[PDB]
Structure to design on (684 residues):
C-alpha cells in the first residue's frame, strides 16, 4: 500500500527530496506547502502536485497524509514538528534539528508523548562511501578502532545555492560540522568529552568557516573532526568527507575520488566506493542526492514495519549536543562534558 | 684550519653523526668517548679516530677540541653540557634535551653564563621535505597560514634499533612527538595553548604509542599533531612526516613519497621533495641521515659566523615545553598554557 506525504518548505534542497520521493517504493507526495507562492508554483508544476498550501496550519487542518516532510530552514522546525505531533502525523525534519538542544529535546519529548515517529533528515551517514566504512569496521577487518579522522575541507561556493549561510553569526559547525560529527558518532560511537576551535577566514561572511574538533569517544577512541570552507585545493573535493580509521589489527583510508583502502592481517584491498548517479542527479551533488533516496526509503520502510529510524530525533540529540558543545568550547576555550548536557 | 670536535656517546645513532662529520666542510672529529669499550673500539676503528676515552671527565681534562657533540642517552645530557660549559666548550646535545623542562632551562642558563653556543640536535626540521614546506610558506605563495596537520603514523619496529624505547613509562611523545611538535613550531610559530590525548595499543610496551595533540598558535593558526606507532598501513611510510597547511590564498600538501603539492592563485604545482641519498645513507632512514649532515654543517657555519643556531638551547625550550605540556594535558584532561611554563 501507498503512503501519502506532505512536504513543507519547497526550497533549494526540497527539489532533491521531491525527485527522491518519486523514486521511493511505497511512498509519494500528495501535497506541498510554502509561504512563498513563487516556490509553491515552481515545485508544484515541476512535480505535478495538485494540492498546494500557502501555510502549514491549513495543510494540517485539511489532513489527507500519512506523514510530513519538513524541509524549511531552522526557524520553523519546532513549530512544524509540534503541529505534526498535535495532529498525530509522523514527521521528518531537516537539519539543523533545532536552534538549541532545549528546543530539540522538547521536540523529541512532544513526539514521544504523541506516539509518532520523528526522524531528522541527516543524510551524510547514508552516503555509499560512509556506509562502506561502517561495514568494513563492523566486519572486524581492522580489529578494535582506537583513532579516527573525519575531514571535509572545501573551497566550493555553497553561498550561491544557499545565501543564508553567509548571514548567520554561526555557520560551518551548524551547517556542515553537524554532518561530520554525526559521521564520527556513526563510525566510532558516542562522545564523552569534546574540545573545539573556530576561525573566520572569508571576509564576505558573518560566521565561522573553519572548525577543528577533538573528540574523546566513550569506547576509548580519539577522533579529529576538521571542517573548512576556506581551503583552496587544486582539485575541489566537494562534497566528499574523507575518513581515516586506525584499529588494533588494521587501517581504513577513505580518500578523495571515493577510493577505499583497507589493510588487515590478510593484507591490503582497494575498492571503489563511488556513489551511483541517479537519473535526476547532478555532479558534484550526486553523492548527497543518492543519500536523500536512501534515507527517504529507510523512513518509508521503518514507518511500514513500525521500527525506529537510524537518525531518529532521540538519536539526533546526541549529534546535536556535540554541535552546541563545540560552540561552547570554541568561545570558552574549555573541554566540554557531553554527558552533562543530555 | 678545520674545527676539531669530540663526540661523546658512540651509540647506534652516533654512527650517522660520525659519517656526517666526515662530509661536513670546516669541521671533523678528533676524539671520541664511550663508557662501553666495545662501542669505543667499533666506532674508533670504523672512523680511524686515534684519541679514545672511557669517560668524559678525562676527555675534557685533556682538551684539544673546539666543540663537543653529545650523542649519549638523556640521563647524562645535563652533566655533559655542564662539563662543556665549565671548560668553555661549545656544545651540541642530542634530543630529548633533558629529563625535565627545569633541567633544560638550567642547562640553557649555564651555557649563556659561560658565553658558549648550545645547539640541540633536533634534525626533523632540517629534512629536505620539511625545508621545502617552510620555503613555500615563507614565499607567500599561499598567503597567511591558518590551519595545519603534522602527522607521523607508522607500524615500524623501532624497538629493535632502540630497545630503551620499549622500557620507559613515556614513549612516543618524548621520542617522536618531540620532533613533530618542533616541526609544528618551525612552520606555524610558537604555541600559546595545547591539548593532548594519549593511548597504549601495543600490549608489549610500558609507554604510550599513540598521541593526538591540538595546538593554538600565537599567530592565530590551529594545528593537529598526530603521532602513532600502532598504525598498520599497506605501504609503510616510516619515517616520513606528512604535512597539510591551509592559508588565505592556497594550500600545501606534503604526502607519502615526498610528493609536495602547492595550490595558489597561479594554479597547482606538484614537485618531488625527496632527500638526496648519501653514499653512507640507507633507505628508508636516508631522510633522517641527510638531515644529520644539514644540521651539523649548519652548526659549523654558525660557529664560524657567530650567529645563533636554529634549534639552539633557548629555542628548543619552546619545543620541550610542548612535550611536557602534552603529558600533563593527557593525564589531567585539561588545556595547558605554554607561556606560563616558560
Ligand atoms: N544534505 C542535506 O540534507 C541538506 C542540504 C542543503 C540544505 N539542507 C537543509 O535544508 C533546509 C532548507 O535549506 P534550503 O537551502 O532549501 O533553504 P531555502 O531557503 O532554499 O528553502 C526554504 C523554503 O522554506 C520556505 N519556508 C520557510 N519557513 C516556512 C514556513 N513556516 N512554512 C512554509 N514554508 C516555509 C521558504 O519560503 C523557502 O522556500 C535547511 O535547514 C538546511 O540546513 C540540508
Ligand atoms: N633523529 C635523531 O636525531 C635520533 C635518532 C635516534 C636516536 N636519537 C637520540 O640519540 C641519543 C642516543 O640514541 P642511541 O639509540 O644511539 O642510544 P645508544 O644506547 O645506542 O647510544 C648511547 C651510547 O652512549 C653511551 N653512554 C651513555 N652514557 C654515557 C656517559 N655518561 N659517557 C659516555 N658514554 C655514555 C652508551 O654506552 C651508548 O653506547 C638518544 O638520546 C636518542 O634520543 C636521535
Ligand atoms: C553540504 C552543505 C552545502 O553544507 C549543505 O548545506 C548540507 O547540509 O548538506
Ligand atoms: C623516532 C625515532 C625514529 O625512533 C628516533 O628516535 C628519532 O628520533 O629519529
Ligand atoms: Mg514514490
Ligand atoms: Mg669533515
Amino acid at each position: 500500500t501507498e503512503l501519502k506525504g506532505a512536504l513543507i518548505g519547497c526550497g533549494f534542497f526540497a527539489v532533491n527530496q521531491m525527485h527522491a520521493w518519486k523514486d521511493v517504493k511505497g511512498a509519494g507526495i500528495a501535497a506541498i506547502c510554502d509561504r512563498d507562492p513563487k516556490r509553491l508554483k515552481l515545485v508544484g508544476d515541476q512535480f505535478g502536485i495538485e494540492r498546494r498550501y500557502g501555510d502549514a496550519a491549513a495543510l494540517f487542518a485539511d489532513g489527507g497524509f500519512d506523514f510530513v516532510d519538513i524541509a524549511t530552514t531552522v526557524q520553523s522546525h519546532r513549530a512544524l514538528v509540534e503541529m505534526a505531533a498535535a495532529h498525530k502525523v509522523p514527521a521528518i525534519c531537516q537539519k539543523p534539528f533545532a536552534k538549541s538542544l532545549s528546543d530539540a529535546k522538547a521536540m523529541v519529548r512532544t513526539c514521544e508523548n504523541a506516539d509518532i515517529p520523528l526522524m531528522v533528515h541527516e543524510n551524510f551517514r547514508w552516503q555509499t562511501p560512509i556506509q562502506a566504512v561502517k561495514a568494513v569496521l563492523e566486519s572486524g577487518a581492522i580489529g578494535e578502532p582506537f583513532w579516527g579522522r573525519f575531514s571535509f575541507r572545501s573551497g566550493f561556493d555553497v553561498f550561491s545555492g544557499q545565501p543564508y549561510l553567509a548571514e548567520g553569526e554561526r555557520f560551518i559547525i551548524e551547517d556542515l560540522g553537524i554532518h561530520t560529527l554525526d559521521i564520527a558518532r556513526f563510525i566510532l560511537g558516542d562522545v564523552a568529552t569534546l574540545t573545539a576551535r573556530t576561525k573566520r577566514v572569508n571576509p564576505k561572511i558573518k560566521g565561522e568557516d573553519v572548525a577543528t574538533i577533538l573528540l574523546d569517544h566513550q569506547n576509548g577512541a580519539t577522533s579529529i573532526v576538521d571542517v573548512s570552507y576556506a581551503t583552496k585545493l587544486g582539485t575541489e573535493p566537494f562534497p566528499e568527507t574523507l575518513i581515516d580509521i586506525d584499529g588494533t589489527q588494521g587501517t581504513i583510508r577513505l580518500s578523495q575520488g571515493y577510493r577505499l583502502e583497507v589493510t588487515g592481517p590478510n593484507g591490503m584491498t582497494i575498492s571503489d566506493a563511488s556513489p551511483q548517479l541517479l537519473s535526476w542527479a547532478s555532479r558534484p551533488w550526486h553523492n548527497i542526492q543518492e543519500s536523500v533516496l536512501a534515507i527517504q526509503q529507510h523512513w518509508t520502510d521503518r514507518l511500514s514495519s513500525g521500527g525506529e529510524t537510524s537518525t531518529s530525533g532521540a538519536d539526533n540529540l546526541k549529534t546535536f549536543a556535540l554541535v552546541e558543545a563545540a560552540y561552547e568550547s570554541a568561545a570558552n576555550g574549555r573541554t566540554v562534558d557531553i554527558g552533562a548536557m543530555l
Observations:
- Chain B touches chain A at residues 142, 146-147, 149, 153, 193, 195, 197, 199, 201, 210, 212, 214, 216, 220, 222, 224, 226, 228, 230-234, 246, 248-251, 253, 261, 263-264, 267-268, 333-335 (CB under 8 Å).
- The longest strand of chain B covers residues 145-153.
